């Protein structure tokens, strides 16, 4: 059950201790390298194009609506525990990308295939059993968080606000999905490279616009978040179920910490060493949770700090859009616009995430099947009725989570050695 979350967060605590709080010092260099200009050494696409591919998958409706779901049920204090999910989760994502160095390219051009299902093959053979298990789960799990959750949320959210959108929104999402992922990951890095920054800057500015117009409410909005999350007034640590569980559960969903489905893209990077790309991948959490998610959470609390009528019982994506429309002139149109690119980005990314993990099982023979399936399920997901899809999504993600976490625990000795190699190169 939910014990996996204590396991997932536990690795974050563990690796941070074993890696000695690496994330705080390496972050600026990693950030500069991630967006640095000019490198071609055995890879499918750039370091930057790898990050934007991963961020495309990492940024999704969980950033828009998944936070709202946590804000309502877990209270505003869930944001702080979403932060804890990312900060300690940085160490997890780094270990994921480092161990992605034990990757072998596949036939049918370089394409390259790296991921936790491969680590386990290079573990201490049982690993062959864990890796094929990981691929079995992830091949399915991509349809949940990566396809159906994102494609349904936009379809319905567009129907509420613009309403001339039955399946039409599903059709356009499928066509634009096939066009990009037709040209494999090389096409993705092109599309995800242009889309993601335009997407993130569009949003983030509107949030900083909202913060600008309501400067005074900023620090109290932080206050209610910190006052909550540590509000033991009710129950002996019974906020575990209220704020902490929803913060962690929805936090892992947005930034994708201990899931083992984040490096799938880092492997395609043109990287000299694991540490070169693994530092760029560690920024996956930071941009999602501490930046994008925090922007969403700040508006939500600010709406709650204000009065505003009728938003008290709003489901999720509609709440945030209403929270934006309340504070900004066209904030409602902004959020629903962002939701389209936020979800579409995540469709393309997790397609590759599922492709390479699928091909582990069947080889490149069925790669054509996975893509056409992903396109069709994207269409069906917008039309079908998936009210509790998030619930079945989180279960698949947890199923994916169990094996990879075991590897990161066991292979901590490998990375800490491999880290002491790269940081030695970092003095030259």
């Amino acid at each position, epitope marked *: 059950g939910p014990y996996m979350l204590v396991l997932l967060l536990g690795t974050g605590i563990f690796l941070t201790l074993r890696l000695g709080f690496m994330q705080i010092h390496t972050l600026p260099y990693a950030l500069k390298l991630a967006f640095s200009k000019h490198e071609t050494s055995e890879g499918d696409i750039s370091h930057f194009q790898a990050l934007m591919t991963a961020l495309a998958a990492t940024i999704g409706t969980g950033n828009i609506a998944g936070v709202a779901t946590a804000y309502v049920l877990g209270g505003p204090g869930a944001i702080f525990w979403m932060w804890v999910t990312a900060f300690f989760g940085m160490a997890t994502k780094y270990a994921e990308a480092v161990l992605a160095i034990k990757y072998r390219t596949v036939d049918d051009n370089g394409e390259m295939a790296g991921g936790p299902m491969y680590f386990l093959e290079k573990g201490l053979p049982l690993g062959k059993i864990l890796g094929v298990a990981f691929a079995f789960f992830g091949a399915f799990a991509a349809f949940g968080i990566g396809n159906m959750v994102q494609t349904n949320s936009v379809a319905d959210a567009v*129907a*509420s606000n613009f*309403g001339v959108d039955p399946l039409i929104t599903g059709f356009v999402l499928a066509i634009f999905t096939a066009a990009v992922i037709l040209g494999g990951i090389k096409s993705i890095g092109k599309a995800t490279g242009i889309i993601v920054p335009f997407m993130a800057v569009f949003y983030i500015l509107a949030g900083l616009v909202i913060l600008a117009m309501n400067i005074g409410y900023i620090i109290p909005a932080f206050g209610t978040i910190f006052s909550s999350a540590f509000n033991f007034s*009710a*129950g002996f640590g*019974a906020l575990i179920g209220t704020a902490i569980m929803w913060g962690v559960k929805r936090g892992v969903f947005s930034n994708e910490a201990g899931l083992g489905s984040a490096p799938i893209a880092a492997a395609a990077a043109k990287t000299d060493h694991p540490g070169r790309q693994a530092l760029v991948s560690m920024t996956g959490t930071f941009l999602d949770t501490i930046v994008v998610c925090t922007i969403t959470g700040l508006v939500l609390t600010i709406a709650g700090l204000k009065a505003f009528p009728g938003l*008290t*019982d709003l*489901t999720g994506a509609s709440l945030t859009a209403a929270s934006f429309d309340a504070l900004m002139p066209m904030g409602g149109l902004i959020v629903t616009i962002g939701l389209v690119f936020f979800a579409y980005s995540t469709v393309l990314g997790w397609s590759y995430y599922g492709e390479k993990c699928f091909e582990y099982l069947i080889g490149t023979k069925g790669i054509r099947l996975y893509r056409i399936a992903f396109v069709l399920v994207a269409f069906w997901g917008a039309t079908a*009725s998936l009210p509790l899809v998030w619930n079945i999504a989180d279960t698949l993600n947890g199923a994916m989570a169990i094996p990879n976490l075991i590897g990161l625990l066991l292979l901590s000795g490998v990375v800490v050695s491999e880290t002491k190699a790269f940081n030695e190169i970092r003095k030259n």
Partner: antibody, heavy 114, light 108 residues
Framework: EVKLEESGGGLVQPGGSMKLSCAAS????????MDWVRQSPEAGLEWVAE??????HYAESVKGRFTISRDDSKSSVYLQMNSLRAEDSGLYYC?????????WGTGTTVTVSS | DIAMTQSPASLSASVGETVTITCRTS??????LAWYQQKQGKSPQLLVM???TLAAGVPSRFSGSGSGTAFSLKINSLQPEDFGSYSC?????????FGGGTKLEIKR
């Protein structure tokens, strides 16, 4: 303030069908997800159907015999019942959902008997 | 299915006293429990949301507490206007279930 007026109740024989309606006002029907809650003549209070603007969920007791629908253009929610049973007798209430049922409706009455 | 059993099924309170009503559930449901008050010829009236949080416009005498496997609705200084049925509801999932009800009557 907010308005929810149910309508369409009546007397219908077993196996028959009818559709209920809930004209809504005072807010934005499109943004909020809606529910149908029914109370039997013995104060049962049983949940019936859910909808948001696209997808729907049903209680197992009525799955396949009820169809919840929505028309945000006309700001009204519907509940279509077919193959009705005696147990479907109750006051059918309209409401909007999320975690708690805050704004409820007037109620409309269904009697299923031969 | 989550089964919520309320006790006492019915009670009579001498006016001006304090009373406590219980809603007990089959499985842990965190803080997702809500309370209603219903009168003759009326829909349920929300009294307390999310176990303890307070709905606006409901008098301060009403207070609810608990989490998980113990919930209580507490009324301080009853009044004749509190005559009715009190129902509890949970928000675990989307098939929200209700309690059997508790009938509040007045002593004379």
């Amino acid at each position: 303030e907010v308005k929810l007026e149910e309508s369409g109740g009546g007397l219908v024989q077993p196996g028959g069908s009818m559709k209920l309606s809930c004209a809504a006002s005072g807010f934005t029907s499109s943004d909020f997800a809606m529910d149908w809650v029914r109370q039997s003549p013995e104060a049962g209070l049983e949940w019936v159907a859910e909808i948001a603007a696209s997808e729907r969920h049903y209680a197992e007791s009525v799955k396949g015999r009820f169809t919840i629908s929505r028309d945000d253009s006309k700001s009204s929610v519907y509940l279509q019942m077919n193959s009705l049973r005696a147990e479907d007798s109750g006051l059918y209430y309209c409401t909007r959902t999320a975690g708690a049922c805050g704004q409820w409706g007037t109620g409309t009455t269904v009697t299923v008997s031969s | 299915d989550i089964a919520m059993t309320q006790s006492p099924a019915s009670l009579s309170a001498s006016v001006g006293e304090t009373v406590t009503i219980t809603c007990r559930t089959s499985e842990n449901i965190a803080s997702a429990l809500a309370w209603y008050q219903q009168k003759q010829g009326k829909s349920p009236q929300l009294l307390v949301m999310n176990a303890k949080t307070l709905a606006a416009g409901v008098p301060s005498r009403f207070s609810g507490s608990g989490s998980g496997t113990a919930f209580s609705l507490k009324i301080n200084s009853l009044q004749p206007e509190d005559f009715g049925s009190y129902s509890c509801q949970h928000a675990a999932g989307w098939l929200l279930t209700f309690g059997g009800g508790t009938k509040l009557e007045i002593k004379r």
